[PDB]
């Protein structure tokens, strides 16, 4: 008599745990699909004199914050417009690095490769032209 | 004399309980087999202008209700053809999100990732092409 | 003489009472063997729109009624085809609960667990599929 | 003097009743050992056009019948070869559902999961391939 | 003569106790089945700045309170809308915890995993998207 | 004087009968202690082609013969090594059923469960491998 | 005495359930093996004026059908030779689309990429050379 | 007296039954361990013209019979070396299916996937190279 | 008077019988607690060249003997260090099976499952690595 | 009479034990969810001359000590700021290995792979750039 | 004449003793149902530096104090908040163990197992995460 | 009276037995919870020259002793630090196998998996790096 | 009494069964850890004149013989250095296939792809360069 | 009760199994992150007069041994600086090759490709200019 009731209790507990696991697995699918992506879609303009970067970055997911920016050398924080809206938009971003200041004078008119770190863990690689 | 009648009473009651448990266990097998699954079989199309989603879903179970949808930004409700029939069918679904409206204009011709919230605790990842 | 008559009377009375007890025990054996067994042998289809439960029940003993049904929130009375015949049959039952009404539309296509309350004290656990 | 005869009568009745209980327990053991076990051994073929199932079922127990079969949408009755012989044999079953017919044509070449409903309180979960 | 009377009394007492045990065992079936199954059915949403929790939860049982919540390592209390009704409905919960404050700005737009601790002892794990 | 003789006669008769009953109860104890124990101890090999069974049994009671053997559907009398000695020892048994012949060819290399009806009212559950 | 009876009943039920699960799992292997994949083997020719596609498709599994075709613009519907036989064969398929009709005239002599939508939830990438 | 006799009879019967169940449970361990599993070890050459399969199969259990083979089109009987020995051997098997004949001629030099429906309720996925 | 004497005799005999039964029941406790428990602590190794088995067995009970061993297809005898001492130990066992001799030479380096048949009514399941 | 009392006691104990097991099982989920997940977010900072490390680690679990750091050939210890704070943060940590010192001067400006080992069995791959 | 008086005395005594036994039986059930049941409902916390334990135990029975606590390797005496109040509460538990000190440093943030020793003779497993 | 005394004595004996069994079952809880669990939590350095082994194994259970070590082809003893304390520590274990020496020198820098057979009945698999 | 005796017997048997199963599972993990992994580390030199193969294979497990070597057209046996010792070694293998004789002369100085069939159920891909 | 005990033991065993599997899995991440990646970073110089070689190599991971070197003509042993330290260095390696000895005089000042066989199992490609 004691065995069967325990069997039913164990069956119910196993069903409950299985349903929780399945629900969490589907939640992972949804969350990972909706995490958010950012990638370059067109050539970006970078102002060498003022260290201002104008970039066009698409977003097919949730809003993402631009935590940091890095170059082939030193990496510096963003000055303005940290937030990235969903969809394709034109962003005005100022880069403030002590070492990079007054070092792009000779490179005006030639392409430069940059990386835009994102808060959600994604990484953005952009190629841009620099102008005075 | 009391011990034997007690033993037979307990045996009969325990047999009844065990049969009930076995029957419920088999009912669980049937219910989980027939719970119903949904998966995509081809490229879908998401209209950019009217936020109209055209998608084909393969169902191998009971009719399911599409309670919600998820897009790049906020989760939104669906307002057309919620019911999902059995077999293979083509659906036309309208999405109602105020904020994400008109953002799809920039992304015409690209590829997008969707999620269709289903009633039976299931999220179906969907791939669609954004068209205007 | 006085002792002998008393001994004879006592022996006869003891034989009578022992026979009565044995007959009662055997009647108990028969009644408990034939008290009635109820179990579910197939997937139950539960409707959320009209709150109607379709179930299959096997009975190898006495016929029994369904006094009530216990669902997620609270026990509710049954209003259709309470009587359970012998053998294997299909019973269609209408459940009337005001409080739990209009909650099951979110569960269409999922699986639900509900318990039947029978007249003879036995509780039959049932696994069912929610459909609209 | 009645005490001794009462004790002897009670001992005899207890012995008979305990023997009955033990015999019933062992008979129940034998019956449930030979109750009838059915499982699949090879992939089943389901014909979308004719709704014919070419399934091979292993039976390690007593003979049992197919009361019904449930498919994605609605459970339906079976037409031929309901009786299942002991041992592994190939069976042909015709499935009749009102609306399910002609819906599986889009599923040709895919995989479908269905469960049969046997007589001995058992549901057999069968994997299947739809065929043209 | 007293032996038969004692045997009868013991038989009746054994019957009463056995019926009580059977009734208790059958009542425990509903008592455990009705405790409810709680599991996520769709991706949740968490606001980093306001630290307010939006989640969708499915319940197949009685109302269950959320005693505490833990996200990374620490357990915090919930502010409002503690009670969880039966069925699938959206839940808005304000989360109060000192450690999380000023930390989630890094994880904007990134998937996170958190668990809600319920009153009935059942635990639910949730996958959620952190939003600004 | 008349009463004392009857009292003496009744006392002596009651003592004699009580001694008889006590001795009979002790005889029941001794006889039921060594009624016979038979339980399978090792894996049994069943020959498919000739339908020959090879099982190992453990005996702790008096020698008991095998009345018959029950198989999935048919019950047939044994033909070899009916007698079971006390202790653990291998037995070779030939089963005689007309229909079982050639039926077990499919299950070569598979497990099967059989029952051996014994003379002393005991049914022994047996697990065996069908090897050709 | 009830405990051991429940033990054997539960053991037999667990054996049956495990056998059914194992049989279904092993059947799923062959079911998902036999579904068969389709991949183009030779260069395909698409006739711009008559919208006729001459493609050879290698089918390594069960027979499938071509529900729809996807081209540079909107999707299309096949009209002839929908059924795909097993093995390698040359197929003649006609595509019917209203708006995209005759637009290929400018692309005569070039190469185009199209995707076929098969019945078994499959998309087949096909490389096509347009001819006059 | 009678109660004590009944108690001892019940104790002895319970010991008998419990030991029988324990012995059967331990026999099940050997029965399931010794059933035998068969898996492919190396690439299997196939003859397209003669429709002969040259496969190497590893068996670590009991002898088994290859009941049938499932090929892309439809399952067919195997007419060569149904018997499988223990250890690792090279088995030459001739497949007898009329419809699929000469279809493999096109696929000479490409890999193919087969399924063998073993006797002991097992399907072995086989990877083979088609040769002529 | 006779009734009083009968009552006294039966009371004394009943007390003695109850003490005997409870003593037997309590003795069974130690008898079954000390029966013997056997399981492997470490992986075994079977030498194909000499058919010597090296296994580590954990015993938490009385001494037991290895009556036989179950291998892939057949049951063979053991001829070395059958006796098992209490406590974790390393044992060397020589296996003699003529029919499947020298077959393991091809299987060197693979896993294998083999079963030990003990004399205490138990079957030990042992995992081993075949080595030369 | 004692049989029913034992039946009730065993049922009560079994129910208590089953509830204890279920409560422990839910504690397992509650423990596992908060065990912590750590992943890199962006390019790290490495100083060759000072051997000072500053790396950003996403933290979603309980704060844990850093047992050590993994370097090219030899594992390394942690000098300061061993404790980690939940959430994205920048922390200055010093590796203390005598041999590795002054070796990094050769590889200034080249990508390097490091590993941070968590105390609770987590090892995370870190990609960094070496700077002077 | 004495026979009737003796029979009446014995009958009254037997009735009184039987009623005493029946009344004693029910109080036993009452005491065992009110014996005190303890189960876990939430994840616990252990401090590495101070070893302070805070756990929530569901209490469905009479107040049962904790005599001691088990740890991974030893038995830990209770030094704080021995008393337990029925219902979910917060307890500050300190363990007086000397050699075990400074052994939780390396486990901070990992799953740990503990067990409570109640004063009523029951033990409950604990799942927890230790913190610094 | 005779029946009443037996009822009382057997009830008391059964109650004592029931408490003994329940106490054993509840003691088994802590007995098997504290049996000893060990896991691997960090990269284990292996020395090629002196065969010195540096591991990191968390001990969340009872104090245990490493009974032996298994390598790719040989099994050898452990030289020092056989005892494993509670909590994560750095363990230096020396292996003494003549054949293993100097063979692993060619495997410097690779990944090697080792086995540590514990004394509590659980085996441990370690991921190790061969260093010189 | 009888029920409690049955309960103790069942508990002891269940503990023994669980111990055996857990020990066998740990044995499985040990065996799979020690089964042996074989891969290639450098280019293989194949002599076209006498079809002699020189390869360098690393091994992390037991010695495994080379059952067969496969060439583009036909599989063949090996003649020397069948045994593969643990650790990185240089092996010389002679292949005997009549058909491929003198065919390799045209491939002198060009890349080729090989295949090895090891005894431990493994296939190895070997890149080789043909030398005259 | 026995079922509950078995459930507890199996759950605990699964706990240790899952923990050890997770730990071993993370160990693989650690080991393969630390395996050691070696590649060329600058133009190498080979002295044809004395077979002297000067290359610059970077080892981002563990110390690795140059077991052998391979050129187009043949592969010979290395005699100079087998050991590789962490970080870049100028390696003066003496190569002993038979066939190609004193044959590079003609190609002095021309590009050549060299291959070195490392200890961990990875090969490298060297672009070197041979000099007189």
Describe the structure.
The structure is a homo-oligomer of 14 chains of 132-residue chains. Chain A has 132 residues and is α+β, with helices and mostly antiparallel strands. Chain A folds into 2 domains: 1-33; 38-131, Immunoglobulin-like (Sandwich), CATH 2.60.40. In chain A, 24% of the residues lie in helices and 35% in strands. Chain A has 1 helix and 10 strands. Chain A has one helix at 2-33; strands at 38-40, 44-47, 52-59, 64-65, 68-70, 75-76, 83-84, 89-94, 111-117, 123-131. In chain A, the strands form 2 sheets. In chain A, strands 1, 2, 3, 5, 6, 8, 9 and 10 form an 8-stranded mixed beta sheet that branches. In chain A, strands 4-7 form a two-stranded antiparallel ribbon. The longest helix of chain A has 32 residues, at 2-33. Chain A is rod-shaped. Chains A, B, C, D, E, F, G, H, I, J, K, L, M, N: The chain crosses the membrane at residues 1-29. Chains A, B, C, D, E, F, G, H, I, J, K, L, M, N: This is DUF973 family protein. Chains A, B, C, D, E, F, G, H, I, J, K, L, M, N: Keywords: Membrane, Transmembrane, Transmembrane helix. Chains A, B, C, D, E, F, G, H, I, J, K, L, M, N: It comes from Saccharolobus solfataricus (Sulfolobus solfataricus).
The proportion of residues in beta strands of chain A is: 25-35%
Order of helices and strands of chain A: HEEEEEEEEEE
What's the number of helices of chain A? 1
Chains forming the largest contact: B-C, 34 and 33 residues
Largest sheet of chain A: 8 strands, mixed
Secondary structure: number of strands of chain A: 10
Protein name (chains A, B, C, D, E, F, G, H, I, J, K, L, M, N): DUF973 family protein
Transmembrane segments (chains A, B, C, D, E, F, G, H, I, J, K, L, M, N): 1-29
Keywords (chains A, B, C, D, E, F, G, H, I, J, K, L, M, N): Membrane, Transmembrane, Transmembrane helix
PDB class: structural protein
